Design a binder for this molecule. Structure first.
Ligand SMILES: [U]
Ligand SMILES: [U]
Ligand SMILES: [U]
Ligand SMILES: [U]
Ligand SMILES: [U]
Ligand SMILES: [U]
Ligand SMILES: [U]
Ligand SMILES: [U]
Length: 517
């Protein structure tokens, strides 16, 4: 943290943050969500980190160079250490990125290395080459060199993600899946794990071996797993929670904006809320049905009337304000809702649905006040505008993610937040073989449009190709875009160092501080 001149700090430097739900894991190679990455950034630090405003900045690597955007060399600071005191080395990153790539690890983010195009990744994922062939090598203890199969000008932007953070080989090998217990874990970020009580709390304590430890101010942070946004707001207002999670409840938000204006932080956020359709399950493998659902949902009612927290009605998957996005707004979005509704009823009648045999399916969502109120409003809107019946089902976060990967579903509530600020951070997730593709969408046309993007060395040509990729997705109605999020949460007046300028919301508790109050 960089504490402004003249601010007076509290004696006690502890922080309580709500984290949305129980993390899937603390293993950087087994995680894929916001809750999971919130905690991962305090414990594991990769090559680069985001600074307080979100810019890619020195992490373990103090400086780096590239040759033709294909060979990237990272110079690792000499005093980077793990919490047990041993040095963080380039060999740590070699082993880690090989473990990420290895199909035996089954990482949900194994495709992150395809997105950066590291050499040999495709064969590695397919089991044709061992993970030791991955295009990474430690030139020495403080030098990590990455070789890509094609130029990737924005490659270094990928490197703040938890999936490319280092893991400690010796703890992993000795303890297997219990390497992350508090008695066994070893960490290299600003914090260390103190306690982990499932469905109760995660407590982190300063890591004195962290290379930037002298600038760390908060000595302890607890992460809570409260999925009820109403409860999170209540425990914030009672004094227990210093920072809510960034999902706000429909029950209380309008009241909050008028009662505590200064605590309600509302900032840009590169995340899209949508209903993910399982594209390989009938009748959702029929474009007419996916299109009807997309068109009959009334975004103005949901975004401006039922939620009304600043979100913007969505017509695409990649948010239009992503760096590099120049999207074409489709004609259906400018129509009236009436005109969308006829076309949608038309398409279902054409798909063979009638009043006597209507379209009935499940709408799965992760337990949450917000998602349940949005799902009920969407069910009612779909019933009224299209005559479809929906059976709502909630599941806890971890289970919800497994279901989506299994494909044991019809439609699911969904949100994707960028990992790096470039359109391929969204678009790559719809690639046929993407480990992140829970829409189970497979389009040879979509895949080729994206493959073409690194075969041109022109930003305009690249942006036009992303725009066409979004058009292919929309044409196929892969998903139901609902709104582009705003980052809305409550933050106590004494929590300093949260700017709201990072559109990725990559917060590091080592950058925060408690003001005397
Ligand atoms: U005190
Ligand atoms: U650039
Ligand atoms: U940029
Ligand atoms: U179903
Ligand atoms: U509620
Ligand atoms: U460029
Ligand atoms: U106080
Ligand atoms: U106090």
């Amino acid at each position: 943290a960089d504490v402004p001149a003249g601010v007076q700090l509290a004696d006690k430097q502890t922080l309580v943050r709500n984290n949305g739900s129980e993390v899937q894991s603390l293993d950087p190679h087994k995680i894929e969500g916001v809750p999971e990455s919130n905690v991962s950034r305090d414990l594991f630090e990769g090559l680069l980190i985001s600074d307080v405003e979100g810019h890619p900045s020195p992490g373990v690597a103090e400086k780096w160079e590239n040759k033709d955007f294909k060979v990237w060399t990272f110079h690792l600071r000499e005093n980077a250490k793990w919490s047990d005191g041993t040095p963080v080395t380039a060999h740590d990153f070699v082993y880690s990125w090989q473990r990420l790539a290895d199909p035996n690890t089954a990482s949900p983010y194994a495709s992150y290395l395809q997105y950066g195009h590291i050499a040999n990744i495709d064969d590695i994922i397919a089991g044709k080459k061992p993970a030791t062939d991955l295009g990474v090598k430690a030139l020495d203890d403080h030098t990590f060199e990455v070789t890509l199969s094609e130029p990737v000008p924005y490659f270094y932007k990928l490197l703040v993600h938890p999936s490319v953070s280092p893991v400690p080989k010796s703890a992993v090998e000795k303890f297997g899946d219990k390497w992350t217990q508090p008695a066994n874990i070893v960490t290299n970020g600003a914090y260390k794990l103190k306690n982990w009580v499932v469905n109760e709390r995660i407590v982190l304590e300063r890591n004195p071996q962290y290379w930037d430890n002298a600038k760390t101010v908060i000595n302890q942070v607890t992460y809570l797993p409260i999925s009820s946004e109403v409860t999170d707001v209540n425990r914030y207002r009672s004094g227990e929670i210093d920072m809510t999670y960034n999902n706000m409840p429909i029950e209380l938000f309008q009241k909050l904006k008028k009662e505590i204006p200064n605590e309600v932080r509302v900032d840009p956020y590169l995340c899209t809320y949508y209903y993910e359709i399982n594209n390989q399950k009938a009748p959702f493998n029929d474009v007419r049905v996916r299109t009807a659902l997309k068109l009959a949902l009334d975004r103005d009612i949901i975004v401006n009337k039922v939620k009304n927290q600043g979100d913007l009605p969505a017509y695409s998957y990649t948010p239009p304000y992503t760096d590099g996005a120049k999207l074409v707004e489709p004609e259906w979005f400018k129509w009236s809702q009436q005109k969308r509704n006829e076309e949608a009823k038309k398409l279902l009648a054409e798909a063979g649905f009638t009043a006597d045999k209507p379209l009935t399916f499940d709408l799965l969502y992760n337990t949450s006040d917000l998602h349940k109120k949005l799902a009920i409003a969407v069910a009612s809107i779909w019933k009224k505008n299209l005559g479809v019946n929906v059976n709502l089902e909630n599941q806890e976060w971890k289970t919800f993610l497994d279901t989506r990967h299994q494909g044991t579903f019809d439609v699911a509530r969904a949100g994707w937040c960028a990992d790096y600020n470039e359109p391929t951070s969204f678009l790559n997730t719809m690639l046929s073989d993407s480990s992140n593709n829970t829409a189970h969408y497979k389009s040879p046309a979509f895949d080729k449009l994206i493959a073409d993007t690194l075969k041109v060395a022109d930003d305009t040509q690249r942006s036009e190709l992303y725009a066409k990729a979004e058009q292919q997705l929309d044409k196929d109605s892969a998903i139901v875009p609902v709104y582009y999020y705003v980052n809305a949460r409550l933050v106590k007046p004494w929590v300093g160092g949260y700017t709201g300028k990072d559109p990725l919301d990559n917060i590091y508790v080592k950058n925060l501080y408690i003001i005397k109050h």
